[PDB]
């Protein structure tokens, strides 16, 4: 057997839909444990200037006692059954999910339905989670990696929903009432806007019976008047420079406007970001690394780490890169990075693009190993792409990409475009925006 055959022989994902609106999806395997969960089109982009931080609080309050299982009964019941319960909030996607034994599937689906539908929101518990979030916002303040990314969003998408942090401003956390949380829940947490994903040793028919028996209680339609649909966010080429010499290492995040979840170009952009690659000072290869930016950065010791990212949203995103370096290495790192962008836009060898493809080929198959990443992939895919995309389809789009495609696509999104730049730390060397903007096209 070969890689191309293995992709075809992989278990085909299957999806059913309840009458009330909920999508129910599943990936069957021979393993005995499984992951099952609920994915929701909810988060910071849906939030507004009044109720920014609602999705976070709810996530905070979610796993504290439900209306039928109070206090820490849910917590005790999940723990005692030999299972894990977990949650997160993206700017566009909130999600709760349970990792458990396949045997435990019915109870897991019930406890998920219980968390979502009938949440308590105890008033004494809101006052405690208020302090917890106020602690956690100071915990994030020290993390320079997160601060620079929140600034990147704030300046890239300035004056729009995407600029908002998922956690929300400290003032909103201090003043967020139960009325806001419940109204945010009643609006956004509903069946047509939700997906029930599962993955492991489990039968699609059974999941659909459990979803029909427990989740069909959710409402399926609007009051005809409060259905929020995403207005597109204005990308603004701009800079934010939190000058702070006291901190040891400068963090820089630079990006141009992204494609959005729907755009086929994403594949070529993933190949593109794979060619430039990513580096950390603990890497083995160092001077002999394939990606010239890493090689140059390793030999000269320009930076501690850099990472090329493509953050995606509904109709836009952030395509660019992140680096952490000594205060005297910012201009150089920036020069090599932009040099690599411009190079890839104008001149791209067939060999390095094949390496770029193979890195991405390996990335897809590496990532979808274990049930939790596959359950995430399902739950995310149905909210973003609409359907689950098979690995064979992905491979078709990777094999589609050659050198000319990478150049046409890189040059489309990066050549002569104003990039959103975010700098935090000892950033006296961070080049002027006009000089950065001059670096976004070539001599040529």
């Amino acid at each position: 057997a070969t890689y191309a055959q293995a992709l075809q022989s992989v278990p085909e994902t299957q999806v059913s839909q309840l009458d009330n609106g909920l999508r129910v999806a599943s990936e069957q395997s021979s393993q005995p444990t499984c992951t099952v969960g609920v994915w929701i089109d909810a988060g910071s982009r849906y939030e507004s200037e009044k109720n920014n931080g609602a999705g976070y609080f709810v996530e905070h309050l979610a796993f504290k006692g439900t209306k039928n299982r109070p206090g820490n009964a849910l917590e005790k019941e999940v723990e005692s059954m030999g299972a894990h319960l977990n949650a997160y909030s993206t700017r566009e996607h909130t999600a709760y999910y349970i990792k458990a034994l396949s045997k435990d599937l019915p109870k897991a689906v019930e406890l998920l339905a219980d968390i979502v539908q009938n949440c308590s929101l105890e008033d004494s518990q809101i006052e405690k989670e208020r302090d917890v979030i106020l602690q956690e916002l100071q915990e994030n303040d020290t993390s320079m990696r997160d601060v620079v990314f929140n600034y990147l969003h704030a300046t890239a998408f300035q004056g729009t929903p995407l600029a908002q942090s998922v956690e929300g401003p400290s003032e909103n956390v201090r003043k967020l009432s139960r009325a806001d949380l419940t109204e945010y829940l009643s609006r956004h947490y509903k069946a047509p806007r939700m997906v029930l994903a599962a993955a492991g040793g489990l039968e699609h028919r059974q999941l659909l019976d459990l979803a029909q028996k427990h989740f069909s209680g959710l409402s399926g339609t609007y009051d005809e008047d409060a259905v929020p649909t995403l207005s597109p966010c204005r990308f603004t080429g701009s800079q934010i420079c939190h000058r702070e010499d006291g901190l040891p290492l400068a963090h820089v995040a630079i990006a141009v406007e992204g494609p959005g979840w729907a755009h086929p170009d994403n594949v070529a952009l993933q190949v593109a970001n794979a060619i430039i690659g990513h580096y950390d000072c603990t890497y083995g290869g160092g001077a002999h690394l394939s990606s010239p930016l890493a090689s140059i950065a390793a030999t000269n010791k320009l930076c501690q780490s850099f990472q090329t990212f493509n953050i995606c949203y509904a109709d836009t995103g952030l395509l660019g890169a992140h680096f952490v370096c000594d205060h005297m290495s910012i201009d150089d790192m920036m020069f090599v990075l932009q040099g690599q962008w411009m190079r890839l836009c104008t001149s791209a060898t067939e060999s390095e693009v094949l390496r770029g493809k193979n890195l991405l080929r390996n990335a897809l198959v590496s990532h979808l190993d274990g049930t939790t990443p596959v359950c995430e992939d399902i739950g995310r895919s149905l909210l973003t792409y609409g359907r689950r995309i098979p690995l064979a389809e992905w491979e078709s789009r990777i094999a589609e990409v050659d050198a000319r495609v990478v150049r046409e696509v890189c040059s489309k999104y990066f050549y002569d475009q104003c990039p959103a730049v975010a700098g935090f730390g000892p950033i006296e060397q961070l080049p002027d925006y006009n000089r950065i903007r001059s670096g976004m096209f070539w001599l040529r």
């Binding site: 104008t346 001149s347 791209a348 150049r407 040529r444």
Partner: peptide, 22 residues
């Protein structure tokens, strides 16, 4: 490979420019 249309365009720029100036 990729510098062929660029060097041709710069070849034209130089050619027409030298014709312009003289």
């Amino acid at each position: 490979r990729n510098w062929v249309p660029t060097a041709q365009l710069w070849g034209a720029v130089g050619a027409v420019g030298l014709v312009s100036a003289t």
